[model samples]
Target: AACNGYVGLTFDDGPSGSTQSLLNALRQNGLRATMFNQGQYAAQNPSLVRAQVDAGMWVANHSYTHPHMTQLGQAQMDSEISRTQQAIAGAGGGTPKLFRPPYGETNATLRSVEAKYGLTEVIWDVDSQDWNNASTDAIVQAVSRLGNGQVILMHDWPANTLAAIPRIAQTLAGKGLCSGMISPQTGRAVAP
Candidate 1:
C-alpha cells in the first residue's frame, strides 16, 4: 500500500444501491480511494461506476455477488472474476487489474485463478467493520489502529461509512499516516 508515512483507504461492495454523496465529499477533499466494485451493481449502475472513475478513484473488483472465493468451485469463481472484469470494462470504461475477494477470503488455488485474469489481490490490514453496521464513531475507532502502509477496509452500503470517511482522514492526518492514493507513477501512497 505504501513504503512509509501513508495509508490507503479502500471501499468495497459498490457502486452501492445509491451514490449517496460519497463522491462529492471525496472530490471536495481531493481524496482518491480504491473502489472494489460488485459486478451486478456496476451493471445496474454503469453511470455511477463511471462517475467513480471520473472522480479519480481506482475502480477494482470485489466479485459479482460478493461471495467468498475460497468457498467457490474453480469455474464458479472464474466466472465471478471474468464477469466482473467485463462489467467494469463496460460500465466504468476501465479495465480492472485489481481484485479484493469478498470477506478477505482467498486461497492458493484462488490466487492461481486470479492470475489467469491478471488480477492483483488486495487484503486490508485495518478494517472499519462498517459492514457490521458499526456507528460512525465506531468506524473511526476501528480505523485508529492503522499503521504505515496498511489498507483500511470499508463498505459503501453503510451510512456510517460515509459519515466516517472525513473523520478517518482527519484522524489519520492527526495520528500521522495521512491518507492518499498510491501514486500511479511510483505505486506509493501520498498524503493529500
Candidate 2:
C-alpha cells in the first residue's frame, strides 16, 4: 500500500517480560512504535531496553516508577525524569527526547522539568485503552480512528495489544497510513 502519511504508535510501561513478544509481533506486522519505559524496568532489564532499540523502536521516558508527577514536589519530579533519561540511555536505548508522564499527569512544573531534560512531552491523540482490557477488535478500531500525524496509546503488557498488531497494520494499510517515529521537536508522528 502506498503511504499517505504516518502516525505514531506508542506503548507504555515496557522493557518488561512481555517486551520481546511485543517486539516480535510488531516486527511481524511491519510496525514501529515508541516504547515509553519505566526507569526501574530499564535499569533492571538493560538488555531488553537494548532489544527495543535493536528492534527499531523509539524508546522514551515514562518516569522512574510510574508515579504521579504532578503530585510530587519539583525535586522529586526532576529526579524521576532525569533518572529515567539516564537509565534508558545507559541501557543503550539512546538519550530519550520524549517524555510521557504516568497516567498522562502533568502541570506547569512538570513542563519546566521536562524542559530541563530536553524532553518533548507527548500525550496520545487516541487511547486504545488496552491496559483496561480492550479487546483486540476494540483496539483495532481505536487505531483505525487515528488521523495523519497523530498518535495512539497502547501498552507493552497487554496480550490483546499484541494480538491487535497485525490487525493494526491492516487497519493502517487500509487507511494508507504507516507507523512512524515521534519527532522530538514536534512531538508528532513523522517519517523516520
Candidate 3:
C-alpha cells in the first residue's frame, strides 16, 4: 500500500558559508527544510538568511550564541531566545515561532522562556549525528535505519553534510520518501 503523508526535515546552526550548497541541493530535490539559525550566524550572513527564506525554506530560532539555555539565569535565557528573534526579524526573515534549544538541552527555565515568546520547542525524533564528523555514507545509513516519521537532524555548517545532502535526497526518493518543513501551528508538513 502507498501512503500519502509527510515528514518534517529540519537543519540547525545554519546560514553558514556551506548553506548555499545545502539550499541548492534541497531545491534540486524539491524538498523544503526548516533552518534553526543562531543569531550570530544571522548577523554574519543576513543576506544568506534572506536567501534561505527566498528559497522557500522555513527559518527558526536556534538562540543567539547556541547557549545552554537550561543553565542560564532567567534573564540570560530570555536574552538568548529574544535576541535570535530580533536577529531573524532584522534579517527580513520574520520572527520564527519555532525554537530548538542548543544540543536539544532544555529544562523548566527554557520552557518558561519559550512561553514568553509564544514559541514551541522542536526536538527531533531522529538525529543524523553528522555533527560528530560522520561520513556521508554513514549519515545515509543512520537516516535509512531510522526510516519514517522522522525529523532528521543535520548541520548546515559541515562540509561532509553538504556532500551528503544530494545522496541523502536520492536515497530517500529511492525509498519512496519525501521531505518538507513543518508548520508548528498545525503540526503538518508544509508543501513545496
Candidate 4:
C-alpha cells in the first residue's frame, strides 16, 4: 500500500446500523467521507444523520425511496428529489446539496430534477461491487486500483465493507495517498 494519491470514499443509503459502525471507524481514523442518505433513512434516524454532520462528514441525498429517476414522471421525480432534500434538512443534517441517482439511472428530466433541487450529481469512478456480494479483499482490491480524483462507490450495508473501510484508508495512507472528496465545482479530488 504505497501512497499513490487521493481518492474519495462515498457511502450511499445510510443512517442504517452499519452506517454508525462505519462512521465511528472513519471518525476515529480522522477521515471525512460523503454519505448519501435516503430520505426515509435520514428521517427515521435523524440522530445518525446529525452525527454525520457533527463529525464533519459530508451529507447528500440518495432519493426518498431509491427509485430509478429515469422511470419516474415529472411530478414523481420532483417529489423524489424535493422530499429527500426536505427530509435531510428537517432531520438536522442541514441541506443536502449533492445527490446520487439510484442505480446510476437518470435521464434528461432526471437531470432537470437534480438541477431544480440544487443537487450536484456525484458519481463514482471505482465501484467495489459490494451490491454484487463481493468479498472484503475484493473491495480492498478495488481501492488498490484507485488513483487521484477517483471516488469509490459503496452501499450502506455491511457486505464486508464495514470491515474493509479502515483497511482501505490505512492502505491508501500507507501509500502516501491522502484521502478526501471530489470537489463539486471543479470535479477533482481534494485531499485533507
User: Which runs of model 1 end up more than 4 angstroms from their true locations?
Assistant: 1-4, 182-192
Q: How far in Å is the alpha carbon of 58 misplaced in model 1?
A: 0.6
Candidate 1 — which pairs collide?
A: none
Best by lDDT: 2
Candidates arranged by lDDT, highest first: 2, 4, 3, 1
The sequence of per-residue lDDT tens digits that candidate 3 reaches over residues 84-120 is 9999999988989888999999998898999899888
RMSD score of candidate 3 (Å): 2.1
The clash count for each model shown is 0, 0, 0, 3
**Model 4, 1-192: lDDT tens per residue?**
353567787888888988778887888876778899999899899899998888768889999999878887989989988989999999899887788899988788888888887788887888899888989999989888778878888877865988887888777886778678667675556765
Candidate 1 weakest lDDT stretch, 10 residues:
181-190
The whole-model C-alpha lDDT of candidate 3 against the native structure comes to 0.81
> Candidate 4, which ten residues in sequence have the lowest lDDT sum?
183-192
Candidate 3 minimal-lDDT segment of 10 residues: 1-10
For candidate 2, the per-residue lDDT at 114 reads: 95
Between prediction 1 and prediction 2, the one with superior TM-score is 2
Best by TM-score: 2
Give me the displacement of residue 33 in model 1, in angstroms. 0.7
* Candidate 3: stretches off by over 4 Å: 1-3, 146-148, 186-192
TM-scores for every candidate against the unseen true structure: 0.87, 0.98, 0.91, 0.92
**Candidate 1, 167-192: lDDT as tens digits:** 87777767756566644334345564
- Alpha carbon lDDT at 60, candidate 4: 90
lDDT (Cα, tens digit) per residue for candidate 2, span 1-192: 588999999999988899999999998889999999999999999999999988889999999999888999999999999999999999999999999999998999999999999999999999999998799999999999999999999999999998989999999999999999999889999998
